[PDB]
Symmetry: none
Subunit: 115 residues, 4 copies
């Protein structure tokens, strides 16, 4: 509920299905601690990564296995992965949607925060 990840395919105009997503949280010693992970569903959305209790303030990294996605579609991409690093600096009942739009040579990402 507090964190959702959505992956779109800009070449085919479809949800990017079964894309692996890893989320890390920056630890007190500046290292990346593994936090949660999953695969996008048929809608391109990855729900249920975390809970309100666990998703505290911090710096989070979302790494998307775009290369495996493209290769499964018959595409050899130029980007090796997609990575989005963001901060939650607002505790409380805040909901984050991290959306990534993918192409073999490009990505775009948007964060929408709602209450």
């Amino acid at each position: 509920c507090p964190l959702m990840v959505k992956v779109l395919d800009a070449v085919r105009g479809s949800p990017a299905i079964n894309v692996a997503v890893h989320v890390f949280r920056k630890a007190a010693d500046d290292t990346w601690e593994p936090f949660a992970s999953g695969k996008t569903s048929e809608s391109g959305e990855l729900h249920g990564l975390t809970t309100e209790e666990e998703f505290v303030e911090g710096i989070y990294k979302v790494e998307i296995d775009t290369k495996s996605y493209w290769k499964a579609l018959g595409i050899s991409p130029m980007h090796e992965h997609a990575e989005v690093v963001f901060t939650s600096n607002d505790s409380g009942p805040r909901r984050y949607t991290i959306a990534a739009m993918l192409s073999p040579y490009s990505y775009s990402t948007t964060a929408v925060v709602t209450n």
Copy 2:
């Protein structure tokens, strides 16, 4: 000189070459009057659309024929075109560059206004 267009292909990671661009200016009867046109060069850029003298205050529409571009590459796109509508004001800055990033199911257009 006062109005430039730059177009990139975010799927192939290249300038979008030979893309037709049409510029319109809103007439007193709220219809779009043809103003200028051209096609992008091998660098994805279109220079010389207009002159300082001809480029007066008004509401301008820039339409980039992305559909013909994608079709010539064998790619089925979503959009008929990519566009920006903006107002030229003589109190504001003096050079307008329309920067367009293209993919078959996603585009961005930005007005970059410089002095």
Copy 3:
């Protein structure tokens, strides 16, 4: 149901609420005919614009009143609107989700087409 529109604010990272959206369909005489309209909800989403019975093949213009959105936030924007023009064909998938991400000088738009 066949057509959904979502509008996001790239400056604030929030849904764009109460944004007016007009959809037009190109008539056989090359004119733009009013087809449907609505305003985005608190989620930035506009549901129920049309029905399967009404949404036939054709060329559609989705015109988003970004100017009123920005002025309600105290901003006089450079883009006068956002416009997304596309063709629906019946041999392909039938549900279109059109998302637009806004700034006073830029927008990006994504199309997701499902069956």
Copy 4:
């Protein structure tokens, strides 16, 4: 010459000036070795990161310090940075340009490979 970075501020419609850029190259032991760095000029462009002789085939990471840019404008952005990882090949086009479009809650990064 072989590697350039260009950054636009899509909220203000202007080149993103004085933006720090760090480039790393993957070493034989899978570690990221610092390769080059610089900052964008008044045109938003960063030239002279490297030379043809030093930019050999390999996997390169380009990290753009978007956080400091927004913070210098008084804005606490969502993202810590914008990054792309790509592979250079000698038997291919020999100029790589990373084009980045920025907003506080949204960005795109594209690799443009030209000859």
